[PDB]
Amino acid sequence: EQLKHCNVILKELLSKKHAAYAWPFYKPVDASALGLHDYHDIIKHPMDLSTVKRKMENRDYRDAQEFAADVRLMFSNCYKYNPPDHDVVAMARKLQDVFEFRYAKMPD
C-alpha cells in the first residue's frame, strides 16, 4: 500500500520536526472572509493542508500521484503569488527538499 506510506509522511509533518512549516500552510486562505480578491484572481485554486487532510480522510486520493500533484500545486501557487524573498517562501522551499527525498523512497 502506497496510501499507507503517504500517511506516514503526513504524520511527520504534523509531528514536530516539520511542524514549523505545517501550521503556516495548515490554514487556508479565506479570500471571501478575509478579503483577498487578488488571491482568487491570480491563483483561482487555493489549496491548503487542511483541505488535503480531508481528502485523505475521505480517501479522495486513491493514489500517490494524486497527492504529489496536489502538493506541487500548493508550492507553485505560493511561489507565483509571492516572490522569493520572505520567510514564507523560504519555508516552502525547505519542505520541497524534504518531500523530494521522501519521494525517492516512496516507490515501492
Side-chain angles (χ1 to χ4, degrees):
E1 262 155 69
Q2 280 280 308
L3 239 159
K4 217 189 220 250
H5 267 275
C6 220
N7 263 274
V8 188
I9 308 173
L10 213 82
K11 277 202 212 170
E12 195 92 309
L13 295 163
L14 247 135
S15 170
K16 22 175 184 194
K17 253 194 196 149
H18 302 333
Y21 324 131
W23 65 263
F25 288 137
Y26 223 112
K27 274 211 213 185
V29 185
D30 294 306
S32 255
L34 251 124
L36 280 152
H37 241 140
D38 243 12
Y39 197 104
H40 210 259
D41 245 312
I42 309 156
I43 317 270
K44 209 164 186 238
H45 245 239
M47 262 229 112
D48 52 279
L49 239 113
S50 245
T51 306
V52 187
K53 191 143 185 206
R54 243 203 196 336
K55 277 119 179 247
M56 324 189 58
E57 283 236 43
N58 249 253
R59 200 177 176 204
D60 188 314
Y61 292 89
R62 355 192 211 168
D63 239 334
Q65 252 112 67
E66 272 242 17
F67 189 82
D70 261 297
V71 185
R72 234 201 189 165
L73 186 112
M74 203 228 283
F75 284 102
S76 211
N77 268 352
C78 234
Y79 246 114
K80 267 241 293 237
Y81 188 97
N82 276 24
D85 217 47
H86 256 349
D87 207 68
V88 167
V89 187
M91 260 164 165
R93 205 199 176 189
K94 272 192 145 121
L95 254 131
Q96 231 220 48
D97 261 337
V98 182
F99 204 57
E100 233 173 282
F101 241 178
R102 260 5 176 155
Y103 215 57
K105 275 226 172 50
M106 235 195 107
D108 204 345

